[PDB]
Amino acid sequence: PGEPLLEIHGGNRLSGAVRTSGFKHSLVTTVAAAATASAPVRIENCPDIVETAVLGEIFRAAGAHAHYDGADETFTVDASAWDRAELPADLVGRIHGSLYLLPALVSRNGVARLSAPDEHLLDVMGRFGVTTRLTADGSVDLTAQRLTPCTIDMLDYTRNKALMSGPCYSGAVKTALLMGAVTHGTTTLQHPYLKPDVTDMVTVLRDLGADIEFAGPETWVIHGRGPESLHRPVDVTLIPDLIEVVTWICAGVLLADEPLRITGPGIDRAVHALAPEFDLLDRMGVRVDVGADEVTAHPLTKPLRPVEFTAMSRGVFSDSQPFLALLGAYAEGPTYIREAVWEHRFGFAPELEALGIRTAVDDTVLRVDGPCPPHRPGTDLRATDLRAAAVLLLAALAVPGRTTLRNHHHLARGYRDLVEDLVKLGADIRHTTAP
Amino acid sequence: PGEPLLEIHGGNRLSGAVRTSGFKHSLVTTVAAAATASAPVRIENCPDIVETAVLGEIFRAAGAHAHYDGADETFTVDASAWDRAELPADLVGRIHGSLYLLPALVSRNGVARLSARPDEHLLDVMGRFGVTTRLTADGSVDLTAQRLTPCTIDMLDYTRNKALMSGPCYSGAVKTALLMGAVTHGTTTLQHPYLKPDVTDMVTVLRDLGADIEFAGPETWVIHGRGPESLHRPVDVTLIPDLIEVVTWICAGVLLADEPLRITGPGIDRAVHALAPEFDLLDRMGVRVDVGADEVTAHPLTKPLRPVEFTAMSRGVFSDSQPFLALLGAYAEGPTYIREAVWEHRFGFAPELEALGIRTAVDDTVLRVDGPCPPHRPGTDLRATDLRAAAVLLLAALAVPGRTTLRNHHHLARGYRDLVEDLVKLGADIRHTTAP
């Protein structure tokens, strides 16, 4: 609450085709890599979201170059003329991805200020000889006269070392790689994050001119030659958004009458990365046809099967489980969902409960008592986050009646225009105001 | 140190047929229900283990009747002439199953002494029925109850995680509450009960004794208790095959046999259905098991297995099944993630599997196996920490083409009739030696 409102009239069956945009998180890592380099980086299949717009403005405010071609979905950036030690606070604080610009700011200027969770990020850069200086305001100053190589076991940034999972795991790996690339010497990273988040950043860094060796399955060696080695021009096509694919599969299975075709350049590679999710889909009884540039989600033909899983760093995405919870409402029996990344991330549960979905929450565990599909109309829902807004919207579309959803502004940070895309499929969603 | 060892020479392929024994835990609950009654209870397919012997001795020591016929594996008990006196402490403390005799004792004599796994949750359950407790210096507890009163209990009160419905006090609290409900005058209503045959079979026994237990809802059990005087009907019951023994043999057949290992047991299909969470994992790993009525057939490896992540929980995979699934994970291509949500700190088998060559990692409630990493290192000295640890180490040792020693294998007698003898019968080279 939450002034603008989404007026949802569910009960309508969706039909047609959807095209996906690039992975938001790999967009962040690619741009962060480009900020350290002096060469232009052309990013194809770039999503038209908030993250792209802000990063572009940050680059231009830094004296660098950034341009997004909407008709081409191409984002070209160049930090060769980068010339700022401090970026506008309001701009930086608008997105989360600005945090990975710190290795660029530190290596280029020697001094950087972190405008007011990032202890792990500061701890990682601290391994490379970066001094942490806190002068109130909740803001931190980064200082480094010179960068030194190091050997880091990335399990130091996990909550559970056996499970190899944690909220600080992913960010620490991304930062360490960036630091190692702008550092002279051999940096060794052990037990690194494995999703395309980090994988695609490695490819970009290699193309820039960095020497990154996969010495072992759990050992990455960075033969760093400083920022001056990153001078080679790069052309990269982003992997389709992993969570957006999950979102559309959930939409097709529950809201469509005919098989929903979901397209994207090299989406088969996105599916392979979603192997934990797809294992669950197969275990639940969800049918998805997989092609090279398209996947096809089939509507329900019978009750799904309940599953038990844990959302973890080297497994099912934390952003994936809310959609799997909604699918659990159509399964016959209890679906157990444990969160091993962002402990308290079941804020969508009380809102799904208003729609008729029965859930139980104890600490890190969510249980869905299927079957309990959403059916209650005339409710007023409040989104708590990005994926919450998405899953609530899909659930509301299944309810033959009127549902109001607020705080849907979160959607812009994960999707281009999820409302508009659903409307194209036949969804009846209207933009209104509270009074 | 002059202490008995197992001398294992692995590398040999096992073959033949194995017959399972009755469920150890169902035996306890059936006997516990019998202790409250005034009628003879004939228990067929009764396992010849430590529990059977001690429970039999406890009955006779209290003036009651108990006779085990090892020929046809039949345990016949009768608590009709059960009198009131001191129960031999050392005798009672020999087994864990004696804890569930408390409802019978407190209801028959009004008093019961709990001589010194936790039992504090047991006392809380009985406390709701009006049982009073007081402490003895050595940690012993004296139970008193002039009159028992019915109660309405949500069993989630005895779980660590309410949403997951899992905890170390869950199953025991349900067993106690059910027993207390039957020996109490009045209507007792239990909510969200434990669902394994462990409890399920005791319900059937109590019903056959004369109790009126009703499944009002999916999560609602109602016991119209009419006291111990209502439990006077003779009962014939054939135990469900031991659930963990089935798991143990399936694990053995897949990894150690060269031909499909036939595993028999009366009504083993019920055991399989109860092991549905375990079998869902087996199917996901690529393990083939042919399921029949009185037999199951476990097939040896034809190709590497697939890794799985799961959580051992009360309404899911057994905690005792996890060590054998960990060993299977060593033959899978990828990381197997195992989370314990019942009995904290029981990955004591992991450092011993490490010595054989198996790659493991342990952090609190989580165990990870980095497959492929099959056991191969010979010439080690393995120490068992518990029952299932001794079994899984013995199976892993039989895979190693060399000599391996295993001690503290005395734990096996509390879970298996004679696991060593049964394995040797299949072609295993296991010898009984001594430490020096």
Side-chain angles (χ1 to χ4, degrees), chain A residues 155 159-164 279 283 308-310 312 314 336 338 340 360-367, chain B residues 156 160-165 280 284 309-311 313 315 337 339 341 361-368:
Chain A
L155 291 187
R159 178 184 293 110
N160 191 280
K161 289 156 176 48
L163 200 69
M164 315 180 82
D279 179 46
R283 285 158 56 187
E308 175 273 309
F309 71 98
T310 300
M312 55 188 186
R314 291 199 171 188
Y336 303 90
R338 183 186 294 266
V361 173
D362 193 351
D363 192 26
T364 65
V365 171
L366 165 66
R367 188 226 317 151
Chain B
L156 297 187
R160 177 188 291 109
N161 193 277
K162 314 269 183 176
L164 200 69
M165 299 189 179
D280 175 68
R284 281 154 56 188
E309 76 88 4
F310 66 94
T311 299
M313 55 185 185
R315 296 197 172 192
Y337 303 89
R339 193 182 210 96
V362 172
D363 195 348
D364 194 28
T365 76
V366 175
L367 164 64
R368 189 227 313 147

Short mmCIF file of all heavy atoms in Angstrom, two decimals, chain A residues 155 159-164 279 283 308-310 312 314 336 338 340 360-367, chain B residues 156 160-165 280 284 309-311 313 315 337 339 341 361-368:
data_model
loop_
_atom_site.label_atom_id
_atom_site.label_comp_id
_atom_site.label_asym_id
_atom_site.label_seq_id
_atom_site.Cartn_x
_atom_site.Cartn_y
_atom_site.Cartn_z
N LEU A 155 34.13 -21.45 0.11
CA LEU A 155 33.26 -22.04 1.12
C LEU A 155 33.26 -21.21 2.40
O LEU A 155 32.45 -21.43 3.30
CB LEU A 155 33.68 -23.48 1.43
CG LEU A 155 33.44 -24.49 0.31
CD1 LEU A 155 33.72 -25.91 0.80
CD2 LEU A 155 32.02 -24.38 -0.23
N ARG A 159 26.86 -20.54 4.17
CA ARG A 159 26.30 -20.82 5.49
C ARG A 159 26.58 -22.26 5.89
O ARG A 159 27.02 -22.53 7.01
CB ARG A 159 24.79 -20.55 5.51
CG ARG A 159 24.14 -20.87 6.84
CD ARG A 159 22.63 -20.70 6.81
NE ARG A 159 22.23 -19.31 6.63
CZ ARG A 159 21.66 -18.83 5.52
NH1 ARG A 159 21.43 -19.63 4.49
NH2 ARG A 159 21.33 -17.55 5.45
N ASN A 160 26.33 -23.18 4.96
CA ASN A 160 26.64 -24.59 5.18
C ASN A 160 27.68 -25.08 4.18
O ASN A 160 27.43 -25.11 2.98
CB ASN A 160 25.37 -25.44 5.10
CG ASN A 160 25.59 -26.86 5.59
OD1 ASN A 160 26.12 -27.70 4.86
ND2 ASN A 160 25.18 -27.13 6.82
N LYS A 161 28.85 -25.46 4.69
CA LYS A 161 29.98 -25.82 3.84
C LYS A 161 29.82 -27.17 3.15
O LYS A 161 30.36 -27.39 2.06
CB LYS A 161 31.28 -25.77 4.65
CG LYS A 161 31.69 -24.35 5.00
CD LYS A 161 32.59 -24.30 6.22
CE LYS A 161 33.05 -22.88 6.48
NZ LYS A 161 31.92 -21.91 6.43
N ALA A 162 29.07 -28.08 3.77
CA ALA A 162 28.79 -29.37 3.15
C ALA A 162 27.81 -29.20 2.00
O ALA A 162 27.99 -29.77 0.92
CB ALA A 162 28.23 -30.34 4.18
N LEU A 163 26.78 -28.39 2.23
CA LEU A 163 25.77 -28.14 1.21
C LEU A 163 26.29 -27.16 0.17
O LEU A 163 25.77 -27.09 -0.95
CB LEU A 163 24.49 -27.58 1.85
CG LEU A 163 23.22 -27.70 1.01
CD1 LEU A 163 22.79 -29.16 0.90
CD2 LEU A 163 22.10 -26.85 1.59
N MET A 164 27.33 -26.41 0.55
CA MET A 164 27.93 -25.39 -0.31
C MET A 164 26.89 -24.37 -0.74
O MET A 164 26.73 -24.10 -1.93
CB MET A 164 28.61 -26.03 -1.53
CG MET A 164 29.45 -27.25 -1.20
SD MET A 164 30.24 -27.99 -2.64
CE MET A 164 31.67 -26.94 -2.84
N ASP A 279 14.43 -31.32 -12.95
CA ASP A 279 14.34 -32.60 -12.27
C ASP A 279 13.07 -32.65 -11.44
O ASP A 279 12.37 -33.66 -11.40
CB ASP A 279 15.56 -32.83 -11.37
CG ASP A 279 15.49 -34.15 -10.63
OD1 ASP A 279 15.17 -35.18 -11.26
OD2 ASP A 279 15.75 -34.16 -9.40
N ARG A 283 9.63 -34.82 -11.75
CA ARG A 283 9.17 -35.56 -10.58
C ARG A 283 7.74 -35.20 -10.20
O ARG A 283 7.03 -36.00 -9.59
CB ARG A 283 10.12 -35.32 -9.40
CG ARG A 283 11.44 -36.06 -9.50
CD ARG A 283 12.52 -35.40 -8.65
NE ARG A 283 12.12 -35.29 -7.25
CZ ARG A 283 12.81 -34.63 -6.33
NH1 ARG A 283 13.95 -34.02 -6.66
NH2 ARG A 283 12.38 -34.57 -5.08
N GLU A 308 9.78 -33.07 -2.40
CA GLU A 308 10.53 -32.57 -1.26
C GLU A 308 11.91 -32.15 -1.75
O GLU A 308 12.66 -32.97 -2.29
CB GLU A 308 10.64 -33.66 -0.19
CG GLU A 308 11.50 -33.30 1.01
CD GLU A 308 12.98 -33.61 0.79
OE1 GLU A 308 13.30 -34.74 0.40
OE2 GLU A 308 13.81 -32.70 1.01
N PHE A 309 12.25 -30.88 -1.58
CA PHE A 309 13.54 -30.38 -2.06
C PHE A 309 14.06 -29.21 -1.23
O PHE A 309 13.35 -28.68 -0.38
CB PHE A 309 13.46 -29.99 -3.54
CG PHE A 309 12.66 -28.74 -3.79
CD1 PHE A 309 13.30 -27.52 -3.96
CD2 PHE A 309 11.28 -28.79 -3.88
CE1 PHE A 309 12.57 -26.37 -4.20
CE2 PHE A 309 10.54 -27.64 -4.12
CZ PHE A 309 11.19 -26.43 -4.28
N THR A 310 15.30 -28.82 -1.51
CA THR A 310 15.92 -27.70 -0.83
C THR A 310 16.47 -26.71 -1.85
O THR A 310 17.27 -27.08 -2.72
CB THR A 310 17.07 -28.16 0.09
OG1 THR A 310 16.56 -29.06 1.08
CG2 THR A 310 17.71 -26.97 0.78
N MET A 312 18.96 -24.32 -2.94
CA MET A 312 20.35 -24.10 -2.54
C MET A 312 21.19 -23.53 -3.68
O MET A 312 20.76 -23.49 -4.83
CB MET A 312 20.97 -25.40 -2.03
CG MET A 312 20.87 -26.55 -3.01
SD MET A 312 21.40 -28.12 -2.30
CE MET A 312 21.31 -29.17 -3.75
N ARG A 314 24.04 -24.57 -5.15
CA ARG A 314 24.42 -25.53 -6.19
C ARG A 314 23.24 -26.44 -6.55
O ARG A 314 23.43 -27.59 -6.93
CB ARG A 314 25.63 -26.36 -5.76
CG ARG A 314 26.92 -25.56 -5.68
CD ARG A 314 28.13 -26.48 -5.71
NE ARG A 314 29.37 -25.73 -5.85
CZ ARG A 314 30.56 -26.29 -6.06
NH1 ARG A 314 30.67 -27.61 -6.15
NH2 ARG A 314 31.64 -25.53 -6.19
N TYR A 336 7.23 -30.14 0.37
CA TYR A 336 8.13 -29.54 1.35
C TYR A 336 9.22 -28.72 0.67
O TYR A 336 9.97 -29.24 -0.16
CB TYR A 336 8.75 -30.62 2.23
CG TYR A 336 7.74 -31.49 2.95
CD1 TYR A 336 7.27 -32.66 2.37
CD2 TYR A 336 7.27 -31.14 4.20
CE1 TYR A 336 6.34 -33.45 3.02
CE2 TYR A 336 6.35 -31.93 4.86
CZ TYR A 336 5.89 -33.08 4.27
OH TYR A 336 4.97 -33.87 4.92
N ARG A 338 12.47 -26.28 1.47
CA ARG A 338 13.43 -25.70 2.40
C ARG A 338 14.32 -24.68 1.70
O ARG A 338 14.87 -24.94 0.63
CB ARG A 338 14.30 -26.79 3.05
CG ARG A 338 15.27 -26.25 4.08
CD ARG A 338 16.21 -27.33 4.59
NE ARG A 338 15.51 -28.37 5.35
CZ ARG A 338 15.37 -28.36 6.67
NH1 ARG A 338 15.89 -27.38 7.39
NH2 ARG A 338 14.72 -29.35 7.27
N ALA A 340 17.71 -22.62 1.62
CA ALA A 340 19.08 -22.67 2.14
C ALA A 340 19.95 -21.55 1.59
O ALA A 340 21.18 -21.65 1.59
CB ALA A 340 19.71 -24.03 1.84
N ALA A 360 2.11 -23.86 5.32
CA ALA A 360 2.62 -23.81 6.69
C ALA A 360 4.09 -23.40 6.66
O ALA A 360 4.88 -23.95 5.90
CB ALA A 360 2.45 -25.15 7.37
N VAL A 361 4.45 -22.42 7.49
CA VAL A 361 5.82 -21.92 7.52
C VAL A 361 6.45 -22.04 8.90
O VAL A 361 5.92 -21.53 9.89
CB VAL A 361 5.90 -20.45 7.06
CG1 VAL A 361 7.30 -19.90 7.27
CG2 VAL A 361 5.48 -20.32 5.61
N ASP A 362 7.59 -22.73 8.97
CA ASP A 362 8.37 -22.80 10.19
C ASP A 362 9.84 -22.55 9.86
O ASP A 362 10.52 -23.41 9.30
CB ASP A 362 8.21 -24.17 10.86
CG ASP A 362 8.76 -24.20 12.28
OD1 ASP A 362 9.41 -23.21 12.69
OD2 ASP A 362 8.54 -25.20 12.98
N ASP A 363 10.31 -21.35 10.20
CA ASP A 363 11.69 -20.94 9.97
C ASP A 363 12.07 -20.98 8.49
O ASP A 363 11.67 -20.12 7.71
CB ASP A 363 12.66 -21.77 10.81
CG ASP A 363 14.07 -21.19 10.83
OD1 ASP A 363 14.21 -19.97 10.64
OD2 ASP A 363 15.03 -21.97 11.03
N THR A 364 12.85 -21.99 8.11
CA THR A 364 13.37 -22.09 6.75
C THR A 364 12.56 -23.06 5.89
O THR A 364 12.89 -23.30 4.73
CB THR A 364 14.83 -22.56 6.75
OG1 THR A 364 14.92 -23.89 7.26
CG2 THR A 364 15.67 -21.64 7.62
N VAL A 365 11.50 -23.62 6.47
CA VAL A 365 10.72 -24.65 5.79
C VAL A 365 9.30 -24.19 5.44
O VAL A 365 8.57 -23.69 6.30
CB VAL A 365 10.65 -25.94 6.62
CG1 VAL A 365 9.66 -26.92 6.01
CG2 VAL A 365 12.03 -26.57 6.74
N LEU A 366 8.94 -24.35 4.18
CA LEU A 366 7.58 -24.09 3.72
C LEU A 366 6.93 -25.39 3.26
O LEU A 366 7.53 -26.17 2.52
CB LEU A 366 7.57 -23.07 2.58
CG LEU A 366 6.28 -22.96 1.77
CD1 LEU A 366 5.15 -22.42 2.62
CD2 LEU A 366 6.49 -22.10 0.53
N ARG A 367 5.69 -25.62 3.70
CA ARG A 367 4.95 -26.80 3.28
C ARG A 367 3.65 -26.41 2.61
O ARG A 367 2.90 -25.58 3.12
CB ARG A 367 4.66 -27.70 4.48
CG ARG A 367 4.06 -29.05 4.12
CD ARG A 367 2.88 -29.37 5.00
NE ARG A 367 3.15 -29.04 6.40
CZ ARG A 367 2.21 -28.68 7.27
NH1 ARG A 367 0.94 -28.61 6.90
NH2 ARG A 367 2.55 -28.39 8.52
N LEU B 156 2.32 -32.17 16.85
CA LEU B 156 3.33 -31.24 16.34
C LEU B 156 4.03 -30.52 17.49
O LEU B 156 5.06 -29.87 17.29
CB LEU B 156 2.70 -30.24 15.37
CG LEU B 156 2.09 -30.84 14.11
CD1 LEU B 156 1.65 -29.75 13.15
CD2 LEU B 156 3.08 -31.78 13.43
N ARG B 160 10.49 -30.90 15.97
CA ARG B 160 11.42 -29.78 15.90
C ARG B 160 10.91 -28.72 14.93
O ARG B 160 10.87 -27.53 15.24
CB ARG B 160 12.82 -30.24 15.48
CG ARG B 160 13.81 -29.09 15.34
CD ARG B 160 15.14 -29.54 14.74
NE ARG B 160 15.90 -30.40 15.65
CZ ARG B 160 16.08 -31.71 15.47
NH1 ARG B 160 15.56 -32.31 14.41
NH2 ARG B 160 16.78 -32.41 16.35
N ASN B 161 10.52 -29.16 13.74
CA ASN B 161 9.96 -28.27 12.73
C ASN B 161 8.49 -28.60 12.45
O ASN B 161 8.17 -29.70 12.00
CB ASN B 161 10.77 -28.35 11.43
CG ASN B 161 10.43 -27.23 10.47
OD1 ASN B 161 9.46 -27.32 9.71
ND2 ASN B 161 11.24 -26.17 10.48
N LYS B 162 7.62 -27.65 12.74
CA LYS B 162 6.17 -27.86 12.62
C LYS B 162 5.73 -28.03 11.18
O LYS B 162 4.87 -28.86 10.88
CB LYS B 162 5.42 -26.68 13.25
CG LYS B 162 5.93 -26.25 14.61
CD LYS B 162 5.23 -26.96 15.75
CE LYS B 162 5.72 -26.45 17.09
NZ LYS B 162 4.99 -27.04 18.24
N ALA B 163 6.32 -27.25 10.28
CA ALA B 163 5.96 -27.29 8.87
C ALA B 163 6.42 -28.59 8.22
O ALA B 163 5.70 -29.20 7.42
CB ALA B 163 6.54 -26.10 8.13
N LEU B 164 7.63 -29.02 8.57
CA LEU B 164 8.19 -30.25 8.03
C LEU B 164 7.59 -31.46 8.74
O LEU B 164 7.65 -32.58 8.23
CB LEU B 164 9.71 -30.25 8.18
CG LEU B 164 10.49 -31.21 7.28
CD1 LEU B 164 10.41 -30.76 5.83
CD2 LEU B 164 11.94 -31.32 7.73
N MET B 165 7.02 -31.22 9.92
CA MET B 165 6.49 -32.27 10.78
C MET B 165 7.54 -33.33 11.08
O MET B 165 7.33 -34.52 10.83
CB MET B 165 5.25 -32.92 10.15
CG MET B 165 4.09 -31.96 9.92
SD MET B 165 2.59 -32.83 9.43
CE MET B 165 1.44 -31.46 9.28
N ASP B 280 11.38 -43.81 -3.92
CA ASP B 280 11.35 -42.68 -4.85
C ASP B 280 12.77 -42.21 -5.13
O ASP B 280 13.10 -41.81 -6.24
CB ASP B 280 10.51 -41.54 -4.29
CG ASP B 280 10.54 -40.31 -5.18
OD1 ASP B 280 10.00 -40.37 -6.30
OD2 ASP B 280 11.10 -39.28 -4.75
N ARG B 284 15.05 -42.47 -8.61
CA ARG B 284 15.73 -41.27 -9.10
C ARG B 284 17.22 -41.51 -9.30
O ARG B 284 17.85 -40.89 -10.15
CB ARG B 284 15.49 -40.10 -8.14
CG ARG B 284 14.13 -39.44 -8.30
CD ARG B 284 13.67 -38.77 -7.02
NE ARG B 284 14.64 -37.79 -6.52
CZ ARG B 284 14.55 -37.19 -5.34
NH1 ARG B 284 13.54 -37.47 -4.53
NH2 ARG B 284 15.48 -36.32 -4.96
N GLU B 309 19.40 -35.12 -3.98
CA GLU B 309 19.39 -34.34 -2.75
C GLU B 309 18.05 -34.54 -2.06
O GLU B 309 17.00 -34.50 -2.69
CB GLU B 309 19.69 -32.85 -3.02
CG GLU B 309 18.56 -32.04 -3.62
CD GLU B 309 17.63 -31.44 -2.57
OE1 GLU B 309 17.91 -31.58 -1.36
OE2 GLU B 309 16.62 -30.82 -2.97
N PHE B 310 18.10 -34.80 -0.75
CA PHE B 310 16.89 -35.07 0.00
C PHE B 310 17.07 -34.81 1.49
O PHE B 310 18.18 -34.53 1.95
CB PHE B 310 16.44 -36.52 -0.21
CG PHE B 310 17.39 -37.54 0.35
CD1 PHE B 310 17.20 -38.06 1.62
CD2 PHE B 310 18.47 -37.98 -0.39
CE1 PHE B 310 18.07 -38.99 2.15
CE2 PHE B 310 19.35 -38.92 0.13
CZ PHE B 310 19.14 -39.42 1.40
N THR B 311 15.98 -34.91 2.23
CA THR B 311 16.01 -34.70 3.67
C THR B 311 15.37 -35.86 4.40
O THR B 311 14.20 -36.18 4.18
CB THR B 311 15.28 -33.40 4.05
OG1 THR B 311 15.92 -32.28 3.43
CG2 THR B 311 15.29 -33.21 5.55
N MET B 313 13.41 -37.28 7.10
CA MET B 313 12.43 -36.68 8.00
C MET B 313 11.40 -37.70 8.49
O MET B 313 11.32 -38.82 7.97
CB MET B 313 11.73 -35.51 7.31
CG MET B 313 11.08 -35.87 5.99
SD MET B 313 10.38 -34.46 5.13
CE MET B 313 9.61 -35.27 3.73
N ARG B 315 8.07 -37.76 8.30
CA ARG B 315 7.09 -38.12 7.28
C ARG B 315 7.75 -38.26 5.91
O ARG B 315 7.15 -37.93 4.89
CB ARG B 315 5.96 -37.10 7.23
CG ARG B 315 5.14 -37.04 8.51
CD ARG B 315 3.81 -36.34 8.28
NE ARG B 315 2.94 -36.44 9.44
CZ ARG B 315 1.65 -36.12 9.43
NH1 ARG B 315 1.08 -35.68 8.32
NH2 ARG B 315 0.93 -36.24 10.54
N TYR B 337 23.41 -34.84 -1.80
CA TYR B 337 23.21 -34.02 -0.61
C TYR B 337 22.21 -34.67 0.34
O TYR B 337 21.06 -34.91 -0.03
CB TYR B 337 22.75 -32.62 -0.99
CG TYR B 337 23.68 -31.90 -1.94
CD1 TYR B 337 23.54 -32.05 -3.32
CD2 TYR B 337 24.70 -31.09 -1.47
CE1 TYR B 337 24.39 -31.40 -4.19
CE2 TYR B 337 25.55 -30.43 -2.33
CZ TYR B 337 25.39 -30.59 -3.70
OH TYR B 337 26.24 -29.94 -4.56
N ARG B 339 20.36 -34.37 4.08
CA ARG B 339 20.06 -33.55 5.24
C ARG B 339 19.31 -34.34 6.31
O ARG B 339 18.31 -34.99 6.02
CB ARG B 339 19.24 -32.32 4.84
CG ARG B 339 19.16 -31.27 5.93
CD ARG B 339 18.29 -30.10 5.50
NE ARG B 339 18.72 -28.85 6.12
CZ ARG B 339 19.53 -27.97 5.54
NH1 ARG B 339 19.99 -28.20 4.32
NH2 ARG B 339 19.87 -26.86 6.17
N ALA B 341 16.97 -34.44 9.49
CA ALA B 341 15.96 -33.62 10.16
C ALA B 341 15.24 -34.37 11.27
O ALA B 341 14.14 -33.99 11.67
CB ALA B 341 14.96 -33.08 9.14
N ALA B 361 31.64 -34.84 3.03
CA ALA B 361 31.76 -33.55 3.70
C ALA B 361 30.58 -33.39 4.66
O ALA B 361 29.44 -33.65 4.29
CB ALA B 361 31.79 -32.42 2.69
N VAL B 362 30.87 -32.97 5.89
CA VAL B 362 29.85 -32.84 6.91
C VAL B 362 29.82 -31.44 7.53
O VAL B 362 30.84 -30.95 8.02
CB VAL B 362 30.04 -33.88 8.04
CG1 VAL B 362 29.09 -33.61 9.20
CG2 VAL B 362 29.84 -35.29 7.50
N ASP B 363 28.65 -30.81 7.51
CA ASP B 363 28.45 -29.54 8.20
C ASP B 363 27.10 -29.57 8.92
O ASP B 363 26.05 -29.43 8.29
CB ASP B 363 28.51 -28.37 7.21
CG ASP B 363 28.66 -27.02 7.91
OD1 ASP B 363 28.50 -26.97 9.15
OD2 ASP B 363 28.94 -26.02 7.23
N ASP B 364 27.16 -29.75 10.23
CA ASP B 364 25.96 -29.77 11.08
C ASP B 364 24.98 -30.87 10.67
O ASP B 364 25.22 -32.06 10.91
CB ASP B 364 25.28 -28.40 11.08
CG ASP B 364 24.25 -28.26 12.19
OD1 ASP B 364 24.41 -28.93 13.23
OD2 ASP B 364 23.29 -27.48 12.02
N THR B 365 23.87 -30.48 10.05
CA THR B 365 22.80 -31.41 9.70
C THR B 365 22.95 -31.95 8.29
O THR B 365 22.13 -32.75 7.83
CB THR B 365 21.42 -30.73 9.77
OG1 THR B 365 21.24 -29.90 8.62
CG2 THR B 365 21.28 -29.89 11.02
N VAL B 366 23.99 -31.51 7.59
CA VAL B 366 24.14 -31.84 6.17
C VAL B 366 25.34 -32.72 5.89
O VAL B 366 26.44 -32.47 6.37
CB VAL B 366 24.23 -30.56 5.31
CG1 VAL B 366 24.51 -30.90 3.85
CG2 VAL B 366 22.95 -29.75 5.44
N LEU B 367 25.11 -33.78 5.11
CA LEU B 367 26.18 -34.63 4.62
C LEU B 367 26.20 -34.63 3.10
O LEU B 367 25.15 -34.77 2.46
CB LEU B 367 26.01 -36.06 5.14
CG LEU B 367 26.81 -37.15 4.42
CD1 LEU B 367 28.31 -36.94 4.60
CD2 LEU B 367 26.40 -38.53 4.92
N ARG B 368 27.38 -34.45 2.52
CA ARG B 368 27.51 -34.45 1.07
C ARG B 368 28.49 -35.53 0.61
O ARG B 368 29.55 -35.70 1.20
CB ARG B 368 27.98 -33.08 0.57
CG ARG B 368 27.93 -32.91 -0.94
CD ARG B 368 29.22 -32.31 -1.46
NE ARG B 368 29.64 -31.15 -0.67
CZ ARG B 368 30.91 -30.82 -0.45
NH1 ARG B 368 31.89 -31.56 -0.94
NH2 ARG B 368 31.19 -29.75 0.28
#
